[PDB]
Homo-oligomer: A and B are copies of this chain.
Amino acid sequence: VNLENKTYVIMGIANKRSIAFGVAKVLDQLGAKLVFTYRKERSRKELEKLLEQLNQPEAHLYQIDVQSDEEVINGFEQIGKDVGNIDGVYHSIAFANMEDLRGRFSETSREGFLLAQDISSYSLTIVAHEAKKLMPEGGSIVATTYLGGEFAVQNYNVMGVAKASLEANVKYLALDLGPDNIRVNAISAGPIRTLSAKGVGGFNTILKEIEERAPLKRNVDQVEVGKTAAYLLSDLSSGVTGENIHVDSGFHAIK
């Protein structure tokens, strides 16, 4: 799994705790050229500071709000002109309003539901469509999901239905872009203390339950997600597509 002369776009670093910073640390350490995309200017600033700890000899940062067709279209188009063709995309992007991450699911608003869908699932489809233009030779696209896409986990509410959508999106992209030699997979990460986690009702309780009940008796970290991301983005996984790998201490396997 050595990746020199590989280029990967990582979407969704906000700070040093971001899962996508785990991927980045692991890919960068394996010698890959990286390009980063962000939404808030605070994320770019965090990216500028975190690039000091990476080996990247230059900073490729692109502002892409995935709610914008044109910002995605022109973002990847630009990445293509700056660095040429890419080997894959790590997609670490999701959003839901805080109302919608606690209390009663049946009370979700249309606007809150569609917002979570647009950012957390559909952004993958359009990223894939635009990213494919930079992978004339094939490549690898990995999204980040959560077990709550597969089962009804208390509080995760609108995001779980967005992750269900995301997971199917992976399969349909896998089928569609398969003949083009682009593999499309997901990582189902265990719960990890991140900026966005602070918004999920009951997140602390779940951390403690993994540690008590999951087979490895411990929580996972971002580097662990990065290690599997390296596998999925590299040749090591050449016959794997439409797959969902649980990086979660075995929790998905137990009841």
- Which B residues are CB-close (under 8 A) to A161? 121, 165, 168-169, 172
A contact patch SS: helix
Copy count, this protein chain: 4
A240:B228 contact, CB within 8 angstroms: yes
A243-B253 contact given A106-B129, A117-B114, A172-B105, CB 8 Å threshold: yes
- Measured in the bound complex, the distance between the Cα atoms of B248 and A183 in whole Å is 12
Q: Does A50 contact B (CB under 8 A)?
A: no
Chain A's interface size range is: 35 or more
B239:A225 contact, CB within 8 angstroms: yes
Looking at A164, A177, A190, A237, the one whose CB has the most chain B CB atoms below 10 A away is: A164
With beta carbons under 8 angstroms apart, the residue of B104, B178, B215 that contacts A174 is: B215
B241:A249 contact, CB within 8 angstroms: yes
- Which B residues are CB-close (under 8 A) to A225? 239
B175:A154 contact, CB within 8 angstroms: yes
A106:B173 contact, CB within 8 angstroms: yes
